[PDB]
Design an enzyme around this catalytic site. Structure first.
Site, mmCIF file in Angstrom:
data_model
loop_
_atom_site.group_PDB
_atom_site.id
_atom_site.type_symbol
_atom_site.label_atom_id
_atom_site.label_comp_id
_atom_site.label_asym_id
_atom_site.label_seq_id
_atom_site.Cartn_x
_atom_site.Cartn_y
_atom_site.Cartn_z
ATOM 1 N N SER A 134 -49.065 41.764 46.123
ATOM 2 C CA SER A 134 -47.887 41.395 45.347
ATOM 3 C C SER A 134 -47.264 40.038 45.694
ATOM 4 O O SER A 134 -46.495 39.474 44.908
ATOM 5 C CB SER A 134 -46.852 42.509 45.579
ATOM 6 O OG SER A 134 -47.505 43.772 45.781
ATOM 7 N N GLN A 175 -54.537 55.302 37.441
ATOM 8 C CA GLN A 175 -54.457 55.762 38.819
ATOM 9 C C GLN A 175 -55.691 56.547 39.225
ATOM 10 O O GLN A 175 -56.164 56.440 40.343
ATOM 11 C CB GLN A 175 -53.250 56.656 39.011
ATOM 12 C CG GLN A 175 -51.922 55.934 38.913
ATOM 13 C CD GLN A 175 -50.815 56.697 39.606
ATOM 14 O OE1 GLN A 175 -49.774 56.978 39.013
ATOM 15 N NE2 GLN A 175 -51.030 57.029 40.866
ATOM 16 N N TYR A 188 -39.566 47.644 39.348
ATOM 17 C CA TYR A 188 -40.717 46.824 39.668
ATOM 18 C C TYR A 188 -41.891 47.226 38.805
ATOM 19 O O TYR A 188 -42.306 48.390 38.829
ATOM 20 C CB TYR A 188 -41.059 47.022 41.131
ATOM 21 C CG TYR A 188 -42.016 46.020 41.692
ATOM 22 C CD1 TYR A 188 -43.376 46.189 41.551
ATOM 23 C CD2 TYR A 188 -41.557 44.920 42.390
ATOM 24 C CE1 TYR A 188 -44.269 45.271 42.102
ATOM 25 C CE2 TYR A 188 -42.437 44.008 42.946
ATOM 26 C CZ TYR A 188 -43.781 44.196 42.806
ATOM 27 O OH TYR A 188 -44.676 43.320 43.354
ATOM 28 N N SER A 189 -42.445 46.265 38.068
ATOM 29 C CA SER A 189 -43.556 46.547 37.163
ATOM 30 C C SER A 189 -44.622 45.467 37.228
ATOM 31 O O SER A 189 -44.343 44.279 37.037
ATOM 32 C CB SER A 189 -43.055 46.658 35.719
ATOM 33 O OG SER A 189 -44.162 46.753 34.844
ATOM 34 N N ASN A 190 -45.841 45.890 37.524
ATOM 35 C CA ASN A 190 -46.932 44.940 37.657
ATOM 36 C C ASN A 190 -47.283 44.324 36.312
ATOM 37 O O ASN A 190 -47.777 43.196 36.257
ATOM 38 C CB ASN A 190 -48.114 45.641 38.316
ATOM 39 C CG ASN A 190 -47.840 45.938 39.765
ATOM 40 O OD1 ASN A 190 -47.484 45.034 40.516
ATOM 41 N ND2 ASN A 190 -47.888 47.197 40.145
ATOM 42 N N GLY A 207 -46.448 42.553 50.110
ATOM 43 C CA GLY A 207 -47.674 42.748 49.368
ATOM 44 C C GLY A 207 -48.305 44.076 49.689
ATOM 45 O O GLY A 207 -48.358 44.500 50.835
HETATM 46 N N1 LIG Z 1 -54.333 54.520 47.174
HETATM 47 C C1 LIG Z 1 -55.165 53.391 46.914
HETATM 48 C C2 LIG Z 1 -54.740 52.060 47.497
HETATM 49 C C3 LIG Z 1 -53.264 51.854 47.584
HETATM 50 C C4 LIG Z 1 -52.670 50.725 46.769
HETATM 51 C C5 LIG Z 1 -51.937 49.722 47.620
HETATM 52 C C6 LIG Z 1 -50.936 50.327 48.574
HETATM 53 C C7 LIG Z 1 -50.371 49.298 49.501
HETATM 54 C C8 LIG Z 1 -49.230 49.921 50.257
HETATM 55 N N2 LIG Z 1 -49.015 49.167 51.442
#
Ligand SMILES: NCCCCCCCCN
Length: 340
Positions: free
Chosen positions: A49, A114, A154-156, A297
């Site tokens: 991020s 996801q 917060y939105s990617n 991030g």
């Molecule tokens: N569960 C899969 C990977 C996680 C995505 C990024 C998480 C970072 C949290 N520090």
């Protein structure tokens, strides 16, 4: 020089389960490097991020060049793109993308996304290429979180859209703007915009994830970063991240008006009144009263931090190579407040 509390905080992260922790810091002058566990001080890592600050910086430069007004509707630049199930780019401005007050559904929360990317399905889909328009499409099946301007979330998707705006303004992929406007002028020799490339540069340690919340640990070092793009794809090290945030807060990348816009923050939580989110940049006031600016991030196997004081004089950046353990705030507090 003196960074003992910060070293201790790296050791605490490793005790909490991080296989290898790294940080660098520079308080006034004299850069310190620390590691704990299995880690190299110059390790390169997926900054997740933190990429957002680079994306926002480019758009603020483009505005300073008179090429875009960030209060323009998104529809002006991306006609028909933000229209799904209540989303309306006619009513959302580019500024609202950059400070997460747009209300636009975050594609990384879509259940099918996801299943492919964040859970064990990652082992099948980790190298798949996602176009920015595909990521936005995922979000556009869904209703917004809120009416534009009415709240914060917060939105990617906001920064994937921001990248698309950069491409429309410049006529080239957004990564080229990051390279030419930031990486090259600041001589960020350990910093890259990998695109769809999955390999890690040297030096690096592995990156580990549970892809879950008992569960097995996976080596997630290699992946196609297009899942993140302009919201999170970059790779850097703890030196270059400091160079960037110091230059940024010092005004070396933006004129006064632009940096002022960047540091105009929204309160993101009633319970944390001193935490603010500006344009791809966050502020926090720490226990000892020191105010820091930067961004966290997160991406698979990589929890990154980068912070600087407002005048850019005191910086910190670092990384944990487990995404399920380690308290990054403890490292920040140790460095800026000497908190044990
Ligand atoms: N569960 C899969 C990977 C996680 C995505 C990024 C998480 C970072 C949290 N520090």
């Amino acid at each position: 020089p003196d960074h003992a509390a910060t070293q201790q905080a790296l050791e605490a992260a490793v005790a909490d389960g991080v296989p290898g922790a790294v940080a660098q810091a520079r308080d006034g002058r004299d850069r310190w490097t620390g590691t704990a566990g299995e880690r190299g001080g110059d390790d390169r890592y997926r900054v997740g991020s933190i990429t957002k600050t680079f994306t926002a910086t480019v758009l603020l430069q483009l505005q300073a060049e008179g090429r875009i007004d960030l209060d323009d509707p998104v529809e002006k630049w991306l006609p028909g793109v933000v229209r799904g199930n209540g989303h309306d780019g006619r009513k959302i401005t580019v500024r609202q993308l950059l400070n997460h007050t747009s209300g636009i559904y975050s594609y990384t929360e879509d259940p099918a996304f996801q299943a492919k990317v964040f859970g064990p399905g990652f082992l099948e889909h980790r190298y798949d290429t996602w176009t920015p328009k595909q990521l936005v499409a995922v979000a556009m099946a869904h209703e917004p979180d809120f009416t534009p301007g009415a709240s914060w979330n917060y939105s990617n998707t906001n920064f994937v859209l921001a990248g698309m705006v950069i491409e429309k303004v410049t006529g080239r992929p957004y990564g080229k703007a990051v390279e030419n406007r930031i990486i090259k002028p600041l001589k960020l020799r350990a910093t890259t915009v990998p695109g769809t490339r999955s390999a890690m540069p040297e030096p690096s340690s592995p990156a580990y994830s549970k892809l879950s919340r008992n569960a097995p640990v996976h080596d997630v070092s290699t992946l196609n970063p297009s899942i993140a793009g302009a919201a999170g794809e970059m790779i850097s090290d703890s030196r270059d991240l400091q160079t960037f945030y110091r230059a940024l807060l010092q005004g070396r990348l933006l004129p006064k008006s632009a940096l002022n816009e960047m540091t105009t923050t929204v309160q993101i939580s009633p319970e944390y009144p001193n935490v603010g989110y500006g344009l791809g940049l966050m502020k926090d006031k720490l226990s000892c009263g020191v105010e820091v600016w930067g961004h966290g991030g997160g991406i698979h196997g990589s929890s990154s931090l980068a912070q600087v004081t407002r005048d850019g004089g005191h910086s910190l950046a670092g990384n944990f190579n487990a995404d399920w353990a380690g308290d990054s705030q403890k490292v920040i507090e140790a460095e800026f407040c000497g908190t044990a």
